[PDB]
Each structure stands twice: as structure tokens, then as C-alpha cells.
Design a protein around this nucleic acid. Sequence first.
RNA 1: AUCCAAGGACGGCAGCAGGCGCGGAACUUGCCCAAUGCGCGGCGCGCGAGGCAGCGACGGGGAGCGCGCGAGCGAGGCGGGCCCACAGCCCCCGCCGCGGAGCCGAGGGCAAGCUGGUGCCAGCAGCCGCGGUAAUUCCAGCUCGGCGAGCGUCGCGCG
RNA 2: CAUCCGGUCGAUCCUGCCGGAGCGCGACGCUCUCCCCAAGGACGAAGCCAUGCAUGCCCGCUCACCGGACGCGGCGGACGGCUCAGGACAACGGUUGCACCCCCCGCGGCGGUCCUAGCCGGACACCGCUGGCAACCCGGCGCCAAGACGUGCGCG
Lengths: 119, 258, 164, 138
Amino acid sequence: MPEITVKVRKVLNNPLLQRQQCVVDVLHPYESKEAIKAKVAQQLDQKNIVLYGFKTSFGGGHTVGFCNAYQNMDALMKYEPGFRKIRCGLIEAPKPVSRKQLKNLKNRRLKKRGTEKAT
Amino acid sequence: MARGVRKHLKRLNAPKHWLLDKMGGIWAPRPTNGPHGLRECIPLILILRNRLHYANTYAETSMILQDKNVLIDGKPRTDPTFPVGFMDVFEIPKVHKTFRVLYDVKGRFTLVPIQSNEAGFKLCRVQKIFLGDKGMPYLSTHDARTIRFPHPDIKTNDTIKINLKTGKIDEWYKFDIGKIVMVTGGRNCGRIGTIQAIDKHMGSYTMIRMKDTEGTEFLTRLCNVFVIGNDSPAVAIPTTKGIRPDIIKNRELRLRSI
Amino acid sequence: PRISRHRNSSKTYSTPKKPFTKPRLDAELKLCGEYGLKCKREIYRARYMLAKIRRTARNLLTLDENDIKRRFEGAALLRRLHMLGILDEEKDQLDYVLGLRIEDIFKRRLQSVIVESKLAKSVHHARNMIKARHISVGGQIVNIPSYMVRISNTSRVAIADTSS
Amino acid sequence: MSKTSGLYTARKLRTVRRVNRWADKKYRKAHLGTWLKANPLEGACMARGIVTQKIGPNSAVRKAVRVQLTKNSKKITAFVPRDGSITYIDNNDEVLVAGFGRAGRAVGDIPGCRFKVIKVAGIGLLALFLRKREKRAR
RNA sequence: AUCCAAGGACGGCAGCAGGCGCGGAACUUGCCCAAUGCGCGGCGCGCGAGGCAGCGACGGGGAGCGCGCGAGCGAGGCGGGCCCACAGCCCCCGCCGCGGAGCCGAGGGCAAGCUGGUGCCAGCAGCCGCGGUAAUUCCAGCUCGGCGAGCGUCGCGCG
RNA sequence: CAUCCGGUCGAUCCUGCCGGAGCGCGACGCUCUCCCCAAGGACGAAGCCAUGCAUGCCCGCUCACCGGACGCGGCGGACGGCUCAGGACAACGGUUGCACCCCCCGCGGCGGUCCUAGCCGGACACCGCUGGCAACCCGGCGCCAAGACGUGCGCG
Ligand SMILES: [Mg+2]
């Protein structure tokens, strides 16, 4: 187990978003980001964080990414791309519906007149 | 011929000084009509996303603006494409950041942090005097502002000081030889210097000759010469005193920074 | 249109105007043997680069010594050549540039620096080792045989810390 | 001397070159327009046609065929080079016909032939003469 | 050009896919608005604009079919990461581990030669020319040369 | 990145052409291990089109049903995307002018109106009853809403 030292770079305050900007690099000459969350938490709740941009350089020695620490969950709930919420343990993802059928339904509905709740 | 006005703007056709990446996308923000024109302005979103980085996307800028988190000339604006121009006032009380928008030597927009003593006024250029309805005199400025009943002593090309809270003239600096100016158009945008001569050609442009503080001399037409005080700037300006270095010095500075 | 249409592209090599010429064939084979070169496109790339350097040097040389453009461009070219190690440090005149040859280009290849450090038994052995990923240029492993090494990293090319 | 050389005489030079550059046979053949109309291939790399009859100091008879171009309806002869390819061409078979090395002119000792046969029923002649493919579908 | 319960009614893909015809000649009747912007509007909607994937030797760039007297390593498959609107793909991590070159030519231009056939026949040949019994040029084998995942042929433009 | 070679003769020097040698654009033939970028029905048919999709949104108007429908109203649909038929002092490119011009949104100003005003009048939509025709299409009666329509208080 090579101890994985992780830093923070380009740290900015976002009171408008009630969050803190962060660039994190992990040196593992790693625990699928979950332990990296704890490490960033100690560097700066552990569930008020989200990690989206994570790439591995050639050879795998150095990996860099971006963080996002929110003051409270409600601020996160308001300010957060939906698919990021699904990726994190935040909400369940309902089964999506194909846009083709929606378009067909919209056209058919536009065809009928007056009360068209039938279809 | 398009049957109407234009609502789009290709990224490759955007002004050079906005510094937009070629691969960012096909489209770029289209500024809306307001205080300043297309080629003499910059959108708010560009300042708030590509510089200060307080936002990462269009949506975040939308939320920040619609929450009323930015003030322009003392007035909150909620349009991401609102045009920001020259000698404007930028305030974000949440982080206590006050900026006045000026020009750098290289010819691009910059934010000059300022104090509370001088953020209650702005400098504007007067370039039109005319008679309105009933014959009442008026005047106009570079930021699309009209004032009724000015002093007769004020003439065209002058410069006017007006309070942000109230559009009432406080003092006016005349256009005369021996006054510090700031160039705002063409090859010499951002250079600071003092006037030396004025030559007029009937029916055409008027050329102005200025000398920099270090002795450099340059020229330009009268349509892009702005007065900023009497022998000394009235406002705080960037770190450098309007000195455009040569290529050798810029390369040396880059090497030092690398 | 798609954004993919704005991606630039160009070739990087040239072909001799007279193909069948015995001396050229023999010289190219000899250079391949002393540098273990795969095909003949690498020599063409080298000649392309050399031609660019020579043309720049010529254009700068036609101009006056005190020409601002001359100073700027010559300084940049000299800095690049020195940082690459192709041109010796003691030389700082543009005239010396015209006397450079592709061999000086070859000597700064990864295989070259590997061999002259005695780290490898041969050019072919060096290439095969490079492929297997046993080499750590600077602190980063590199598997490109034609990777060029600058002066500041020549002392830092080592064996991979992960290789067996 | 012979040519004009005054400082205000570019018009005459342009006119003279414009007039005199029509004397070259190649330039005429390329820019005049007669050849393009008279060429049964109308500037195309090669044509698709239909064969209709087989015929053939050196004293060797060369094997060729009469063809009619689909898009043109004029008649020409195209010569099948590779040995044993006469049997590979049958009367009323779709073919693709290109040109010899010398555009327009005849090539070699063959009199009155200026084309080549390179495909029959959609198979390259070279691919068939080497037995790579086979014409069992026709 | 279409539907008609024959009185009437209806249409304009040089928009995205798809089809017929034409020609020497050119792809999926896919998913999504997450990104860049547009319209409306406050905590969003819609957009075949636009993005992602599928086909794709127009094409461009980077590696490889071994080095050595034994070890090593690829492509390939199995699982986990990361990325992604969802999926792929690159890259990282453990286990088992497919090593494959063709297209032209050998008289000169033009680098590159040994027997058997045929006999101005069959054929080669951009030009000169070969073939009417050693055919250094056709048809096969051996050998050899060029370029190389590319090679050759046809037409056009520049030189 | 300033290059030439073979062919008229019994032999030789010239003129002069023919052919070869390179690059790019496409089409054809053969062949093909791995990764990255990437064009793609334009080539005297601007020829013809099944099938499906490509422009909606909402601030005002709820005794509709249990506020979401629907419809009136407002904004937009003149941007975007496809192609190069037509057209040769035109278009187009650089440079002037309107003291011969028009201009939505947006920004800043200004805002004095001749001769029931605690707030005016009537309609239509959707909708209920009644019906025509294959289809497309609409009819007749009926109460009801407006930031809709009409009139209109007022310092020329
Ligand atoms: Mg009145």
C-alpha cells in the first residue's frame, strides 16, 4: 500500500454558489475516488463533496481532478448538474422515455381539435 | 439579403480581443443593444465565467444574475449578454469586489480594483450637442446617456463627471493641449499620454499628436481620444502607466515568468 | 458545420526528386545501419526539419545585424537549438547554423542518448527495450523511439522504476 | 529592340501574349473546346459501355472489340491487352473502358485503337487474369 | 402528383435520415439537449441548430511482425476503475496470453540474372524496340531490386 | 529545397518535337496488425419523392374537471439550416455620403392635451343542447372572462 498523497490547487470561494472551488491531484505510484473524498475533506460533512473530472496520466503515476465542496446539502441540491446527482448517491434515476415517442405524441395531439386529452 | 436583423454570432467571427478559444464551439454570445456597441463592449458572461471563474457554464451565470448578484453603475442587471464597456463600474457586494473597466496596453479589457471614495462617479465623453423638442438643449455620451439643460461652457469632445446615484454633472475637463489622455481606438488602444498638437483637415478627420511619459510619440484620430484629468489622472489606473513595451522586453518578461 | 472541420493538418516529409541514385541509396542505407532506422520516412522528416532551419537562417542572414526582426528571430532560433542540444553551447552565431547536418539531429534521439550512456547493448537492443517500457525519461516513462531529449533531461533519463 | 520596353506599355504586352499563346498545339487542344466535344469520353476518367462485336513490321494481330457508350451512343474500339482475355469477354457484356497512356493519340503499333478494357461484369481484368476472382456469375 | 362512399379535397425534402433515376463517382430511415448558442419565461421547457455514437484505405500522423543463447513483451479475452445525458473509446489496475506484407519490376531511360516452353503464332511494349530456334524484353520456376500497410493503373492541373 | 535522360544518321554537330523522371485532386485493381485526427450524392439531372422528424413558450384571463385541461391574449416564427439555377460596367472587394432616408428589442431621458373617473358598454373563444359530410370542413341557439375590442375624465 503506497500512501497516496493528495493536494489541493486553485482553491476559490464561491459564496454565490455557497461552494469552494478545488483542483485535486492524487499521487499513487487509488480507491475509486471514495477515499479521495475523505482526504479532501481533511485537507479542507464528507458527503458535501463531489468529484467529476478525473483523468490518469500516461503511466498512471499522477492523476489530477476537480472537487466541489458545498456549505449545506440544500445548496448542493439547488446547484448541481442532475446527472452528477445520479452519479453520486443523491437521487434515484427513473427510467427515461424515448424522445421519439414524445415527438409522435405531440404531433398526434396537435392534429386533434378541441379537447384532445383522449390520447 | 437577410430579411431582418441578426440574432447570432459565429465564434470565428467574434472580435479578436475577447480571446475566445477556436474549439470552444461554433457559437459565441451575442451582446444586446444598450450602453455600448458590439465592437466597443464585452458581455457580462465572459467576465463572470472566463475570467473571474465564479461560474463554469451558462446556467450558473443565469442563476447568479437572476438572483441579482451583480451591480452595474449602481443598477442590478440580469441579462447574461448585457454589454460592458469603458469606464464602467462593477460591484459585487457579496465579496466586496469593486472594479472599474479600463483598457490594458495590449488592447484588451481589464478590471481595475478601486476604493469606496471614487466609486460614486464615472467619467464619460461628450460627442453630440443638439436641440430637442421645444428647442431645449441636450447632450449625449459614449454610454448612451442624455442630460437636459447643460452649462453653455461645455462643448463637444469634452469629458464629464457624473454621480452614479444622480446623473448630475459635477465637473467637466476641457479638450485642450497639455492634457493627459487615454487612447481607446485602433493600434494604440490603452496608451496614456499628453497632447502636443492638433491639426484639422476640412471635411475629414482630425489628427492628434501625443507624447508618452517616457518620450514616445504617436498619433490617432479624434474619435478615440479620451480625457482623464488635468495633467494627472482623476481615477486609479492599472499597475503600468500606459507604456507599451517592445517585443524584446515582452519576450524577456515571458522568459522570466517561465 | 461540425467543429471537426477547423482542425488543421499538414504533412511532415519530402521525397527526393530523383529516386534511383546509387550514392543516395548507399548513404541512406549506411545511416539506417548506424542508427537502426526502420524505414526511409524518418530521414525525410530529418531533411524537412533541416531545410526549415536552413531557410530561416538564410532569411535572417540576408538582413542587417541591427535589424530588430533579425535579433528577435535569431535569438529564438539559437535558444531552441541550444535547449535541444543540437548546436553546441559555445556557438552563438547564425552562420554556424548553416553547417548543421541530420547526423546532429540523430545524435539527440532517445536511442542515441540511451546508447552513449552505455545503458543498452546496441541500437536494436535499445529500441526493443524502449518498446517494452523499461525507460523513465526524466520522471516519465516514454515508449517513443524517436522522442528527442533536451539537454536538461539527458542526465535524467533512467530505467523505469517499475520494470522488472 | 524587337520587343516593347517602355514604362507605359503593359497593355500591348498583355494583348500580344493573349494572341500568341494560342499557337501551341497543347494549349489549343486543352483550352479551345473542340476536343472536349469531339472526345467520346467527355473528359471522364473512364466510361461504362456495352460490347457488340469481337475483332482483332510486327505482323501480330491485336485483339479488340467494338463498343457503344451508354451515355453517348457513339461507336469506338477498345483493345483488350492481357493474354487470354478474349475468351473472358462475351458478346453483349457490360464493360468499363479507359484510355491508354497517351491521351487522344494511338499507342504502339495498333492502328485505330485508343482505349483499354479494364472490367467485365464488374470484375477487374487483372484480378481475373491472375485467378484472384472468377466470372461464374456470367 | 395523390385520396374519393365520384359530388369534392389536397401537394411541393436545393432541412435531417431514407428511396428511384443518373453517372466513373459518394454513409444510419440511430440517441440526447449535458456542453455552444437561440426563443419564451424566474429556480425550466423546446431546438435533425448543435453534440455523441454507426459505416468509412478521400486522406494525414504515431508504433509493430523481434532482440538474443534467455528472458522479456505485445495484440487478444476475462473482471475492476476512470470517463460518459446512457453506453462505448483512450488511459490505469489484476488473471490467461495468436507475432501475420503485399504491390510492382529485372535491355536502355531505370536500382535489380538461371533453366523449360512457343516460334513474326500467342504476346510484351508510355519511347527506342523483343519475338522468323540461346527470346538478357512473352509464358513458368529460382534468384534479385524498389517502396512499404501500402503499392500499382486512368484523367486533370503545376513543374 | 536554381538538376536532367532516350529517340531522325553509314558516323557528327544543331533546330524541333515525342517519351521518361516529381507533387496534388479524384476514380479503378490488389492487399491490410494496433492507436490518434478526419472528408463524405457538387462534377452540363436547381431531376422526381413514399415513410418519420425538423418552433414553440408564458408572465395576464379559471364557477372547466378535482389548481393541471382547452381556448382568448402576448412574444417568436423575417434568426437558423440547404444549394449555386440564374446573372458578366451587375454581383463582389477596398474607400465615401445621406445637408435625399427607415428602424423592433434593449439603454438613458422626457412626460403640461381645446370644446359614471370608488372604475363605462357589448361581444366571441373554449364550453352545453341541437346537426350536416366518405374525407377536408364547418352550421344554429345559449349564459360567461380580459394587460382583448369600443367610448373616454385631462394644464393646447
Ligand atoms: Mg380634449
